[PDB]
């Protein structure tokens, strides 16, 4: 179809990005233009016509996912029978800012970051794409403060921190949906403002304890799935008789912020707001921040 390959000869491999965290993604310099890029091996051999078919479907989708708040595909290169995808390289993550401000970020800074994260995730959701692994490491930040989300999870293409995982993911619900990303965003609301993870569990069951001692008992579906899931070895969930609400843990946080977080962190995934509804929240709409920042975000056009 419409897919033409560039050359790997112009790139110099400077090493793996993020000390190898995101896998075999190579930080590369384009020796023709000086641009720095992120290159991932994509296909081991285009000799297999079936693997080739699947690969071109994915490239077609990656091209449709061009957005100011996503790491974008720049080109595809071919070396021998291998394919490589070239994406943008972004220098910093939101971790760098959290490390500078360990007692919480500035209010407007959180507005700008969350607006962009929700904008980027909402765009993917409109293409029926779920990230499923939002965390500070995957939220890149350009020198200009433009957020670029990276490492989305793609279906039909075929240890890790659990702090941002929704209850449906923890209990093994295969009917999870876009609401898992909204849960992850709600986890980031309090983290950015307070300088500490909301639910820093060290196992799936420990993560569930963190969540429910704050937010209460799970919906019936998730308790039943938990009881059937063999990874929990017949163990049973705790019964919450007096949760500790977010505003009790963080009594200084504004009502508007606690409302935003509570909505994203609804125990029932179906009662969480969509990403678009999140941008209409008072947190973003008060004093016309959304209008102003939306036009301000024309630093995307350099
Ligand atoms: C959005 C769309 C749906 C495509 S995708 O994001 O889902 N797939 C492409 C993909 C897959 C896996 C990893 C990456 C990746 C990771 C990191 C960076 C980066 N900076 C850094 O690591 C700095 C040291 C912190 N610059 N560029 C990157 C790219 C990208
Ligand atoms: Cl609460």
From Swiss-Prot:
The active site is at 133 (proton acceptor). Its EC number is 2.7.11.22. Residues 11-284 form the Protein kinase domain. Keywords: ATP-binding, Cytoplasm, Kinase, Nucleotide-binding, Nucleus, Serine/threonine-protein kinase, Transferase. It catalyses: L-seryl-[protein] + ATP = O-phospho-L-seryl-[protein] + ADP + H(+); L-threonyl-[protein] + ATP = O-phospho-L-threonyl-[protein] + ADP + H(+). A motif ([NKR]KIAxRE) lies at residues 52-58. One of its GO terms (molecular function) is protein serine kinase activity. ATP binds at residues 17-25, 40. Its main location: cytoplasm. Expressed in testis and kidney, and at lower level in brain and lung. GO terms for cellular component: centrosome; cytoplasm; nucleoplasm; nucleus. It is found in: Cytoplasm; Nucleus. The [NKR]KIAxRE motif seems to be a cyclin-binding region. This is Cyclin-dependent kinase-like 2. It comes from Homo sapiens. The lineage of its organism: Eukaryota, Metazoa, Chordata, Craniata, Vertebrata. The gene is CDKL2.
